[PDB]
């Protein structure tokens, strides 16, 4: 059972594709954010989060993503492996991106502060 | 580079050299570097309608028509890639001439020295 900090560090390294030494500032920022008191998530109820996600997807005319989400939610509920379904649903909702909206390519301008 | 362009813009707007606007540049870099929640509206037409409504609310119907015409021209020109974002920015920076600018109290100047 790898400590959550080590697992998060490995996840960050894997997702960004950089060594631990190159992500030190980002690691510090992440540690500060995770240790910082964050306001409660918009929805902490599994059924309320699922309903809000469905309503948001239908309102955005993203029916395919809504169907995929409904299927994944049904599978998660039937599998019964996750103890805190509401937390996972809230995370997925927070990470949802509209596939129709072209990913806002982070302007090169962010690089000015990196130095 | 976008950073150099922003610096030149700041220098031009403030009328000071790049060296005199270093703190404002740092503040801008900090603001831009902060993670922002997704914008409320990413649709060009919704932003245009909001801008028109905001201009009408200030009883500036002529300015509202001028804004609608300029927005139509910008959309047809196709030079801007993110029309909704630019329209939202312009609406957000619009000021009602009837609403007296909340004059930054002279007291802020006391600490500048």
């Amino acid at each position: 059972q790898k400590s959550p900090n080590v697992l998060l560090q490995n996840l960050c390294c894997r997702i960004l594709g950089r060594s631990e030494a190159d992500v030190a500032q980002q690691f510090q920022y992440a540690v500060r954010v995770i240790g910082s008191n964050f306001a409660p998530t918009v929805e902490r109820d599994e059924f309320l989060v699922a309903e809000k996600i469905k309503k948001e997807l239908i309102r955005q005319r993203r029916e395919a993503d809504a169907a995929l989400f409904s299927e994944l939610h049904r599978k998660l509920h039937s599998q019964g492996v996750l103890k805190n379904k509401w937390s996972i649903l809230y995370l997925l909702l927070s990470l949802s991106e509209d596939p129709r909206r072209q990913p806002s390519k982070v302007s090169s301008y962010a690089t000015l502060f990196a130095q | 580079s976008p950073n150099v362009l922003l610096q030149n813009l700041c220098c031009r707007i403030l009328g000071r050299s790049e060296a005199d606007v270093a703190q404002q540049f740092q503040y801008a870099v900090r603001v831009i570097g902060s993670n922002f929640a997704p914008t409320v509206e990413r649709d060009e037409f919704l932003v245009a309608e909001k801008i028109k409504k905001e201009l009408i609310r200030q009883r500036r119907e002529a300015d509202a028509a001028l804004f609608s015409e300029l927005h139509r021209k910008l959309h047809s020109q196709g030079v801007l890639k993110n029309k909704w974002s630019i329209l939202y920015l312009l609406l957000s920076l619009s000021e009602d001439p009837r609403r007296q600018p909340s004059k930054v109290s002279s007291y802020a100047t006391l600490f500048a020295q």
């Binding site: 306001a39 409660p40 998530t41 918009v42 929805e43 809000k52 309503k55 927070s94 | 929640a37 409320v40």
Partner: peptide
Amino acid sequence: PLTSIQIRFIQNMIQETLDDFREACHRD
């Protein structure tokens, strides 16, 4: 008088709008 169905619809719409606003504020 707003019918029970119309009353329920208006209540649900207001609740949805307020939930969306609360969610947006929480995310912000």
